[PDB]
Design a protein around this ligand. Sequence first.
Ligand SMILES: *C/C=C(C)/C=C/C=C(C)/C=C/C1=C(C)CCCC1(C)C
Ligand SMILES: *C/C=C(C)/C=C/C=C(C)/C=C/C1=C(C)CCCC1(C)C
Lengths: 217, 216
Amino acid sequence: MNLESLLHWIYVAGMTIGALHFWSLSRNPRGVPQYEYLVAMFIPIWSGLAYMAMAIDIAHYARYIDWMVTTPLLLLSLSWTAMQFIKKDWTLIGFLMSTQIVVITSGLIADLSERDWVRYLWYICGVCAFLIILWGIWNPLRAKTRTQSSELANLYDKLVTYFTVLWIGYPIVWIIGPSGFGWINQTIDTFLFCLLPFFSKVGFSFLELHGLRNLND
Amino acid sequence: MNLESLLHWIYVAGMTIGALHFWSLSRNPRGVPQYEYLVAMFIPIWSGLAYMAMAIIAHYARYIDWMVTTPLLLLSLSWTAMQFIKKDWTLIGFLMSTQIVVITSGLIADLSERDWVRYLWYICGVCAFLIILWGIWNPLRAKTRTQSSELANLYDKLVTYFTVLWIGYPIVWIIGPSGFGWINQTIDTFLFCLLPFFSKVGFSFLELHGLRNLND
Ligand SMILES: *C/C=C(C)/C=C/C=C(C)/C=C/C1=C(C)CCCC1(C)C
Ligand SMILES: *C/C=C(C)/C=C/C=C(C)/C=C/C1=C(C)CCCC1(C)C
């Protein structure tokens, strides 16, 4: 077992404990609907299985297949929270989910590219889609909370802030590592791509679910 | 000049004449707002330039064309569906983004070494495309039911035409060198010249003349 494998196995253990936690919470719901629990549970399982694949073995192909599914589901969870006590705006949800899939596919195309100028344009394409996500979660998604209580609005702000900080991390780590400028080697890059998603997948959903449970009482 | 190059140049001239026509119509608009003309003009210009580049993976620029023109085509279709009502921009964005997923999936599929990987990405693109088809036939179609039956009937003809052509793309892809290889690159190129002509000039021609005739 090499270092990358070990980091991946640790991440797999992390996902496993978070999903069990979310499962445990789902059994004593405290006013939180089951669909929120189930998505919160599915995210780390999907990511867990993708990382397990890498642990058993372009580099880290499975990382993209993880993101293909987990990142729109994370936006779904964020969107459910913003609209917790109102009608769910499904086309807004759909907008955010699909735009986020463009970010990931752009990243993958970028990483599959042999010419540097092409690689970076696809990266920029990914960043642009990501900027639309950030505009989306800070403006129209955020305005949905204004018709609801300030407890919910405050919870959202905390969640969207935590969400934003972590998500900005991905394009940065991508571009400083072997896929981009090569300022860091693959093993350190893998390490950051374990630490960052643990907080995005377990950390975020943990704050989401506990926030919603305390808000209900 | 070889055969594909000639086909791409004929396509360029096709795009050029379509773009001039729509520009000409915009000067006597008949109640059709300028933004609909401008998108109708932009589509074949973008496509023409991508094909011009090709005339001067195989056919990369074909995807870069699609990256832009297919969501713009969905923008036009949407504007038509909501011609005499408030624009549902989140519905528009959903269709536009989902359509970009179709194209990026298509490209990733075409970039894939392993066959099983190629085909899964193809399937993913087909799934996103199925969601587009559901979108244009259901929530987008429902927008027309609040408006006049003349508009509703026009949309019905337009969405049918739109749907028929768009189904051709995943077919032409899979039967050519990117898929099963039932047809060579030259014939594949020929189809990828015919189909877009009808999707870009044909559809916008029917959209614009349909809306103008509806207003009188
Ligand atoms: C659990 C995993 C998460 C939340 C991953 C998020 C990943 C991103 C926000 C990736 C963004 C990228 C760009 C904005 C530019 C292209 C490169 C990507 C895919 C790393
Ligand atoms: C002017 C060009 C147009 C309207 C192109 C449309 C292209 C498609 C609808 C392509 C669809 C595909 C799939 C559904 C599966 C993946 C392969 C593609 C990209 C050919």
